Design a protein around this ligand. Sequence first.
Ligand SMILES: [Mg+2]
Ligand SMILES: [Mg+2]
Ligand SMILES: [Mg+2]
Ligand SMILES: [Mg+2]
Ligand SMILES: [Mg+2]
Ligand SMILES: [Mg+2]
Ligand SMILES: [Mg+2]
Ligand SMILES: [Mg+2]
Ligand SMILES: [Mg+2]
Ligand SMILES: [Mg+2]
Ligand SMILES: [Mg+2]
Ligand SMILES: [Mg+2]
Ligand SMILES: [Mg+2]
Ligand SMILES: [Mg+2]
Ligand SMILES: [Mg+2]
Ligand SMILES: [Mg+2]
Ligand SMILES: [Mg+2]
Ligand SMILES: [Mg+2]
Ligand SMILES: [Mg+2]
Ligand SMILES: [Mg+2]
Ligand SMILES: [Mg+2]
Ligand SMILES: [Mg+2]
Ligand SMILES: [Mg+2]
Ligand SMILES: [Mg+2]
Ligand SMILES: [Mg+2]
Ligand SMILES: [Mg+2]
Ligand SMILES: [Mg+2]
Ligand SMILES: [Mg+2]
Ligand SMILES: [Mg+2]
Ligand SMILES: [Mg+2]
Ligand SMILES: [Mg+2]
Ligand SMILES: [Mg+2]
Ligand SMILES: [Mg+2]
Ligand SMILES: [Mg+2]
Ligand SMILES: [Mg+2]
Ligand SMILES: [Mg+2]
Ligand SMILES: [Mg+2]
Ligand SMILES: [Mg+2]
Ligand SMILES: [Mg+2]
Ligand SMILES: [Mg+2]
Ligand SMILES: [Mg+2]
Ligand SMILES: [Mg+2]
Ligand SMILES: [Mg+2]
Ligand SMILES: [Mg+2]
Ligand SMILES: [Mg+2]
Ligand SMILES: [Mg+2]
Ligand SMILES: [Mg+2]
Ligand SMILES: [Mg+2]
Ligand SMILES: [Mg+2]
Ligand SMILES: [Mg+2]
Ligand SMILES: [Mg+2]
Ligand SMILES: [Mg+2]
Ligand SMILES: [Mg+2]
Ligand SMILES: [Mg+2]
Ligand SMILES: [Mg+2]
Ligand SMILES: [Mg+2]
Ligand SMILES: [Mg+2]
Ligand SMILES: [Mg+2]
Ligand SMILES: [Mg+2]
Ligand SMILES: [Mg+2]
Ligand SMILES: [Mg+2]
Ligand SMILES: [Mg+2]
Ligand SMILES: [Mg+2]
Ligand SMILES: [Mg+2]
Ligand SMILES: [Mg+2]
Ligand SMILES: [Mg+2]
Ligand SMILES: [Mg+2]
Ligand SMILES: [Mg+2]
Ligand SMILES: [Mg+2]
Ligand SMILES: [Mg+2]
Ligand SMILES: [Mg+2]
Ligand SMILES: [Mg+2]
Ligand SMILES: [Mg+2]
Ligand SMILES: [Mg+2]
Ligand SMILES: [Mg+2]
Ligand SMILES: [Mg+2]
Ligand SMILES: [Mg+2]
Ligand SMILES: [Mg+2]
Ligand SMILES: [Zn+2]
Lengths: 83, 208, 99, 104
Amino acid sequence: MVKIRLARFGSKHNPHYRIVVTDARRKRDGKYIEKIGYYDPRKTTPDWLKVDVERARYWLSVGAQPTDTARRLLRQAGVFRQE
Amino acid sequence: GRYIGPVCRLCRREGVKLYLKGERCYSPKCAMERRPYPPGQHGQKRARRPSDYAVRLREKQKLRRIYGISERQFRNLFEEASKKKGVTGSVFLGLLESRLDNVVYRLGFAVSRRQARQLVRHGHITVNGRRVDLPSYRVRPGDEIAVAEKSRNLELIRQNLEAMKGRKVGPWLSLDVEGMKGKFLRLPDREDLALPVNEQLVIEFYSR
Amino acid sequence: RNLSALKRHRQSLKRRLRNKAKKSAIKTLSKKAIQLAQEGKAEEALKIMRKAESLIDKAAKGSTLHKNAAARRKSRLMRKVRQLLEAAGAPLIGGGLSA
Amino acid sequence: PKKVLTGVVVSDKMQKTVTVLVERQFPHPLYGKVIKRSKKYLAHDPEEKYKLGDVVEIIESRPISKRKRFRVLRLVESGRMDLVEKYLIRRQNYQSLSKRGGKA
RNA sequence: UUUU
RNA sequence: UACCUUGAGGUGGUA
RNA sequence: UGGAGAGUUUGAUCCUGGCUCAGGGUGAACGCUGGCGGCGUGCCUAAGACAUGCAAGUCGUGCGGGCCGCGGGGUUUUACUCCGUGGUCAGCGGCGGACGGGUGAGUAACGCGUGGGUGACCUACCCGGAAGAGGGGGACAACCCGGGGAAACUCGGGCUAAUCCCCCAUGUGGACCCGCCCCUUGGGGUGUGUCCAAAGGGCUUUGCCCGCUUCCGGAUGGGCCCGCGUCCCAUCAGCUAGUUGGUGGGGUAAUGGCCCACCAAGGCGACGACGGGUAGCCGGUCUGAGAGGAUGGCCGGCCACAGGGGCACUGAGACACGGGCCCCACUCCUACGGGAGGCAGCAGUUAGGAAUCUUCCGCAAUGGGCGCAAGCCUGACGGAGCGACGCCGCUUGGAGGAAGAAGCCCUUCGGGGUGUAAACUCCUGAACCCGGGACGAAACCCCCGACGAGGGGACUGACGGUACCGGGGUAAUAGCGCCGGCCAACUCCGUGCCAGCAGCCGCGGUAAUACGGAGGGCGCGAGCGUUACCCGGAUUCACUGGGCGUAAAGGGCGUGUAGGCGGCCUGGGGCGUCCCAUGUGAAAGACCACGGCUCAACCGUGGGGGAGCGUGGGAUACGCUCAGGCUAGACG
Ligand SMILES: [Mg+2]
Ligand SMILES: [Mg+2]
Ligand SMILES: [Mg+2]
Ligand SMILES: [Mg+2]
Ligand SMILES: [Mg+2]
Ligand SMILES: [Mg+2]
Ligand SMILES: [Mg+2]
Ligand SMILES: [Mg+2]
Ligand SMILES: [Mg+2]
Ligand SMILES: [Mg+2]
Ligand SMILES: [Mg+2]
Ligand SMILES: [Mg+2]
Ligand SMILES: [Mg+2]
Ligand SMILES: [Mg+2]
Ligand SMILES: [Mg+2]
Ligand SMILES: [Mg+2]
Ligand SMILES: [Mg+2]
Ligand SMILES: [Mg+2]
Ligand SMILES: [Mg+2]
Ligand SMILES: [Mg+2]
Ligand SMILES: [Mg+2]
Ligand SMILES: [Mg+2]
Ligand SMILES: [Mg+2]
Ligand SMILES: [Mg+2]
Ligand SMILES: [Mg+2]
Ligand SMILES: [Mg+2]
Ligand SMILES: [Mg+2]
Ligand SMILES: [Mg+2]
Ligand SMILES: [Mg+2]
Ligand SMILES: [Mg+2]
Ligand SMILES: [Mg+2]
Ligand SMILES: [Mg+2]
Ligand SMILES: [Mg+2]
Ligand SMILES: [Mg+2]
Ligand SMILES: [Mg+2]
Ligand SMILES: [Mg+2]
Ligand SMILES: [Mg+2]
Ligand SMILES: [Mg+2]
Ligand SMILES: [Mg+2]
Ligand SMILES: [Mg+2]
Ligand SMILES: [Mg+2]
Ligand SMILES: [Mg+2]
Ligand SMILES: [Mg+2]
Ligand SMILES: [Mg+2]
Ligand SMILES: [Mg+2]
Ligand SMILES: [Mg+2]
Ligand SMILES: [Mg+2]
Ligand SMILES: [Mg+2]
Ligand SMILES: [Mg+2]
Ligand SMILES: [Mg+2]
Ligand SMILES: [Mg+2]
Ligand SMILES: [Mg+2]
Ligand SMILES: [Mg+2]
Ligand SMILES: [Mg+2]
Ligand SMILES: [Mg+2]
Ligand SMILES: [Mg+2]
Ligand SMILES: [Mg+2]
Ligand SMILES: [Mg+2]
Ligand SMILES: [Mg+2]
Ligand SMILES: [Mg+2]
Ligand SMILES: [Mg+2]
Ligand SMILES: [Mg+2]
Ligand SMILES: [Mg+2]
Ligand SMILES: [Mg+2]
Ligand SMILES: [Mg+2]
Ligand SMILES: [Mg+2]
Ligand SMILES: [Mg+2]
Ligand SMILES: [Mg+2]
Ligand SMILES: [Mg+2]
Ligand SMILES: [Mg+2]
Ligand SMILES: [Mg+2]
Ligand SMILES: [Mg+2]
Ligand SMILES: [Mg+2]
Ligand SMILES: [Mg+2]
Ligand SMILES: [Mg+2]
Ligand SMILES: [Mg+2]
Ligand SMILES: [Mg+2]
Ligand SMILES: [Mg+2]
Ligand SMILES: [Zn+2]
């Protein structure tokens, strides 16, 4: 079951994740299938969250269950809005 | 640490006036001023023709011993200068001229570089507003090197920024004496600097 | 000690014994069918092929055989029966072969 | 794409199987000189259609056996033992260059 | 014869 | 171990 | 955007040529020394042996019970018994336990790398689409009864539930045989015959949720196969019987001597078979002007292993590190019959060693398993601890201060040196103290809305009272190596071929810039030296880039096999070669730019390059091949 979750890339105390598609069984920081965004929990810059609704929507449309947090982030970036 | 110790002795070994004390180095006493021979029990005996090596070694020392930087930092800067575009020798000098402690010196907020350094590590200096206590902090162009209000009323700062009244400053810089603040306008062009150092020889000391 | 997974073992044993039994019939009947065919007894040689067929697919229902494993068996069986009945046979009940 | 190679048939001695000597050429990784290496493939000849001296194309295929994973795609040019010869002689040279010495 |  | 003799030694001499 | 050389064979010279030094690097270790912080990093040797705790479970919304408890019923009361409910223990059943974590033993190999094949295949959970779930029967644990054993644990008898097992049915559909069609290896369609489905549960109870069955497809993961590439020794040259191929069969998801029976007599090798040695491979790392050399620790990918060897069971998946069986070695228990074990998981012990840490905090964050959910589990992870092991940042003070203290050192006894150095004056003020005090955390969930979109609300941090901010405030660690030349830095005294130094050349036999000390000097600075190891310099294995008369080096000569090399003209092909396009070349790293932490180290984002190989198209001078021709080579 492929997923859309976060991958740890910062440094001690300087966390930086990568919203990423991957097979649920892989290391969290391992070989991902595709990077579909990034996110800085500490918002150290005005650009602490980018996604790519297009790609997010592709993977979602083909299984890919997102982590609760990833789901959250995806939402915030207009992934599910339909209005 | 950064040396600490008999300094108007480095002046003597290098056989030229290095200003590592600001005042006094102008008075009839910098030692280089009457007693120009290197320190130690041998300084007065006739010198032997120096090996090309000796020259560059002494030449590199002269230049580094000026900014009070450690061989470590000095070396790293030079390496960065080499890797960078533009004529390395030039770039090197500029990069050194960009150290905050140095700018604090060029602007006159302090007499010497050592004094300048302490004024930085003691938080009396500010960059664009926030204070910076990193002598090796690199100043970009357009940044505002200044004194923190909480420090503008210190006897040292006074004597210093006062003596600066009417006194002119480096063309790559600018100073507003009353506001106790200055600006790093441009990377000093090699020609702007007038250091008693033939940097080409330094590039060579590091090629060997 | 004691890591309640011995359970998984306990179960494996029950499952093993269940699979084992299922396959055993499949073989027995298959052979049986192959035997009657190689003797010309068409009507019942097929009769049993039909059972073997059922038992195979049936085994493939759960995880005893499962897969194309089931299919091979069915294949090879019909394969050998129709062929052995090439001794005057003449499929009667056609309880499995489509002539 | 299934690999396709060309070579000479240098052995008929097998049932439904021919040994195809495929020559290869290329620049030496360090010395440049274009060198020529070669390798024998045991290709599948179902209807024993090909014979000694037949330049044939070989096609990458589903394993027919061990040591045998190519089928003969077609016949390029027939007859020409000049090649089979080079090969045969080279094998014969090995003759005795062991404890004694092959034959020249 | 040893060493210079 | 010391002096002879060496530049200083080896051997050798004188206790 | 990139390339330095020097010392040493001689009385002297040129050359040859080896040795040696300067540079860079390291999971280091050792000596003298040692203040703070950030980020990294830390058994390289015994894949040696391990005490102890923790490291994989979860689900009452699949099921029936035991034990401990409360409440309400059927009576006039009792016995007996019915319902509801709390705690608890496992059991049956399910999903997970094949991931995550560890190690490098083995392996020179389709193991890895790169590019391809699969008409020869599989894929649980996830997504899309089609269809469906009617009826009946059954057993084993739990529990109950009895027996065996020291123990582990075990044998028998009986009762019983289910999403447990089975039979019949329905056949969307699918599987198999035969035929036909299209395709072309086993791909797709079609006809007859045969065979094959299902499970229930929860409710905000007529609907919705979780779930079940069959089929088609998607997505992800994977098996198998192939071209090319992958260390040393030829003082290893011949190797091979399932060995090479064939027919049939077994086996698997699937091809295949994978295995078997039968037949054939093959297969491999100097383009290095076979044997021996060594070794996980890679992205990359270090070095280098480059070509190249060396390397494969941290991190990421793949492989292999789990005390040594073998084996299969269960499963979508294992031949299964914390599952099973057997043999072996060792340890433990033993009523001597028989049993229990497996840290190359975190931490820790011991042994080996020059040498490598805490039996720590937390599940808050990211990630994972199970659950509708609450939530549980998670030594994965996020943090802290220890070690200058590395990198980066910071301090031990700043300005003034005598033609110059004392002491020590030298002395032509005038003086010279350490030295603005100290003293001392003034200034700032690391530590330390007081107060405040964080981002990392907004989801899951609940409410409104249709459990959707969307909006509203609540809970939650180990690190941490830490970072950071404000206030107050003390002049407050320096050491190590070297000073004959290479190589930057010189004098006195001691010693007397001694004691000693020493990287190479060499230095010491009474004037030693070379020994030990001292004054002084050079270098670097919380380090500095040493030892080991890799690249460099070394065009000193020379592809870039060397040589062989006398320096090391032409084979004693010929004949000749393989192989390497090939005169002039034309044409065909287009293999080499060259060109365009396209696919591939993961991330990290490296480079460039910008950005976050006061800087930097460290990190984030974006950009650019890229050999090799696949595919399609093209060129034809040279090489190649085929065909024709020539006469200058050759032969007659
Ligand atoms: Mg440059
Ligand atoms: Mg369970
Ligand atoms: Mg001597
Ligand atoms: Mg003597
Ligand atoms: Mg000589
Ligand atoms: Mg000489
Ligand atoms: Mg001579
Ligand atoms: Mg030389
Ligand atoms: Mg640390
Ligand atoms: Mg640590
Ligand atoms: Mg180890
Ligand atoms: Mg050990
Ligand atoms: Mg062990
Ligand atoms: Mg109960
Ligand atoms: Mg339970
Ligand atoms: Mg290994
Ligand atoms: Mg070997
Ligand atoms: Mg391959
Ligand atoms: Mg590949
Ligand atoms: Mg595949
Ligand atoms: Mg579905
Ligand atoms: Mg019974
Ligand atoms: Mg049907
Ligand atoms: Mg139908
Ligand atoms: Mg049925
Ligand atoms: Mg069932
Ligand atoms: Mg697939
Ligand atoms: Mg070998
Ligand atoms: Mg090994
Ligand atoms: Mg080189
Ligand atoms: Mg790794
Ligand atoms: Mg084993
Ligand atoms: Mg074992
Ligand atoms: Mg399973
Ligand atoms: Mg199975
Ligand atoms: Mg296991
Ligand atoms: Mg096992
Ligand atoms: Mg295994
Ligand atoms: Mg274990
Ligand atoms: Mg351990
Ligand atoms: Mg020891
Ligand atoms: Mg957690
Ligand atoms: Mg979680
Ligand atoms: Mg636990
Ligand atoms: Mg950790
Ligand atoms: Mg004095
Ligand atoms: Mg004096
Ligand atoms: Mg001072
Ligand atoms: Mg927040
Ligand atoms: Mg929670
Ligand atoms: Mg909502
Ligand atoms: Mg010198
Ligand atoms: Mg001497
Ligand atoms: Mg002397
Ligand atoms: Mg010396
Ligand atoms: Mg000395
Ligand atoms: Mg430092
Ligand atoms: Mg070297
Ligand atoms: Mg070389
Ligand atoms: Mg050599
Ligand atoms: Mg050459
Ligand atoms: Mg030479
Ligand atoms: Mg000679
Ligand atoms: Mg010679
Ligand atoms: Mg000759
Ligand atoms: Mg000779
Ligand atoms: Mg020839
Ligand atoms: Mg030619
Ligand atoms: Mg042509
Ligand atoms: Mg031509
Ligand atoms: Mg071509
Ligand atoms: Mg390309
Ligand atoms: Mg990359
Ligand atoms: Mg910045
Ligand atoms: Mg990047
Ligand atoms: Mg092409
Ligand atoms: Mg042409
Ligand atoms: Mg011709
Ligand atoms: Zn001075």
